[PDB]
Amino acid sequence: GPPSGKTYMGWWGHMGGPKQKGITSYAVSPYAQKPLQGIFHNAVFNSFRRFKSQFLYVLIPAGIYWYWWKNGNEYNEFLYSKAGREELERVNV
């Protein structure tokens, strides 16, 4: 097999990141850890903190559109009803 073009990712041992020095990591065995807790008591008030931050970028747009739909849908329901049949003839063709 011949050589291929250079990329932005190597593989274990030469991943191609910056020389790391000074960073030290500690970790523990999953076997030696509390039989899966964290849920409730410690990370229940922590949960849902996300989408309490984001929920506005989601809500405002949803609101703008759901409102626009509803509103526009009622005007439809009206035009084709007995009452609006006079206005319907105006804006139709």
Binding site: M9, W12, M15, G16, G17, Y57, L79
Partner: protein, 385 residues
């Protein structure tokens, strides 16, 4: 060196499913990919097994499917699974694509990955249409008619391309028998397109939610994502199980239970749900040619993103205006589909057109403008010269 590493075949696997360096921080949105892979399998398998009972013939078509529905043991499970799998395929695909837009997966060096992805999107929509035709119910025949007729818009040869596809004077036996063959073929082409998609993904690795380099902290795909992909796999199955067994026809259209009829287009004719936003766009332009050109454009404009995105950082995680407008885009897409579902009546027409505008405007105006503005906002917000 280990066998899985040295062997010709196993090594391909090892470097794609076992030792593949993943960014420690990729979230569940990155699980969409494996799900699409599963859909392809489900679709392909359920399909081959039904082919063993299906008849391409325009006369026997609808009935053979009903034969699969009644006489074939577990037949209904195969059909309800194929049918609902297609719809789930699209739900998951849209999500996979959405994850792409949001996290800026399309830019960086991953362009080719994106472009191949778009091709797949086009190929899938095609495949599904061909398959939908095989049932040959009212929605089938008319969808077959309307869609093949999209090509009559081509200037001169246009009508020839159409009667050529049909292989006759209208949608008939030749058209269904051929569409079955094509429906069988394309999926394999998709699989093929999927490997290329994976190959491009494999040179630069997957991206992460921060939008920065992952190279500093990776964890092998195995004994991590194999188990994490499994969580969403099981959920995916559970939710599909619910439809396949307790709500098998909710995602479908009733008219597709009445055999096709060339002399009658139901007043209730309506496209499959996942095609609506597109159907909506075409309907908004009151000209034949433009409607079809604008629609195809709605798909192709996806290719323009790695260029209009003027940002100097990747992804929406730290951009405010971006997130907001991104969400204006998503819902606008849903509203667009909602429109395709309604009739061509006074309050809805103008709405469809505005929504269409917004859609195209997001890619050609919003993204380039906002991305520029946010770039400066970032600079002047901490620079003191």
């Amino acid at each position: 060196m280990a066998f899985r590493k040295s062997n010709v075949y196993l090594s391909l696997v090892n470097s794609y499913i076992i030792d593949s360096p993943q960014p420690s921080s990729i979230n569940y949105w990155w699980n969409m990919g494996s799900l699409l892979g599963l859909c392809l399998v489900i679709q392909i398998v359920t399909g081959i097994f039904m082919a063993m009972h299906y008849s391409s013939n325009i006369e026997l078509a609808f009935s053979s499917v009903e034969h699969i529905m009644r006489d074939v043991h577990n037949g209904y499970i195969l059909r309800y699974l194929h049918a609902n799998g297609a719809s789930f395929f699209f739900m998951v695909m849209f999500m996979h694509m959405a994850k792409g837009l949001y996290y800026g997966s399309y830019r960086s060096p991953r362009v080719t990955l994106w472009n191949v992805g778009v091709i797949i999107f086009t190929l899938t929509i095609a495949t599904a249409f061909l398959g939908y035709c095989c049932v040959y119910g009212q929605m089938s025949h008319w969808g077959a008619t309307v869609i093949t007729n999209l090509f009559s818009a081509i200037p001169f040869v246009g009508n020839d391309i159409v009667s050529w596809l049909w292989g006759g004077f209208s949608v008939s036996n030749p058209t269904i028998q051929r569409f079955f063959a094509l429906h069988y073929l394309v999926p394999f082409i998709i699989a093929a397109m999927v490997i290329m998609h994976l190959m491009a993904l494999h040179i630069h690795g997957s991206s992460n939610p921060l939008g920065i380099t992952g190279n500093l902290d990776r964890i092998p795909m195995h004994s991590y994502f194999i188990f994490k992909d499994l969580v969403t796999v099981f959920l995916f199955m559970l939710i599909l199980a619910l439809f396949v067994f307790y709500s098998p026809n909710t995602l479908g259209h009733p008219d597709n239970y009445i055999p096709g009829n060339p002399l009658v287009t139901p007043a209730s004719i309506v496209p499959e749900w996942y095609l609506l936003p597109f159907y909506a766009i075409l309907r908004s332009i009151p000209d034949k040619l433009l409607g079809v050109i604008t629609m195809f454009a709605a798909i192709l404009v996806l290719l323009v993103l790695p260029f209009t995105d003027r940002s100097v950082v990747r992804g929406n995680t730290f951009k405010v205006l971006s997130k907001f407008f991104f969400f204006i885009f998503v819902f606008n897409f849903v509203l667009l589909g909602q429109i395709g579902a309604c009739h061509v009546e006074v309050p809805y027409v103008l709405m469809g057109q505005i929504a269409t505008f917004i859609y195209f405007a997001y890619f050609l105006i919003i993204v380039p403008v906002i991305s520029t503005i946010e770039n400066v906002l970032f600079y002047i917000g901490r620079v003191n010269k």
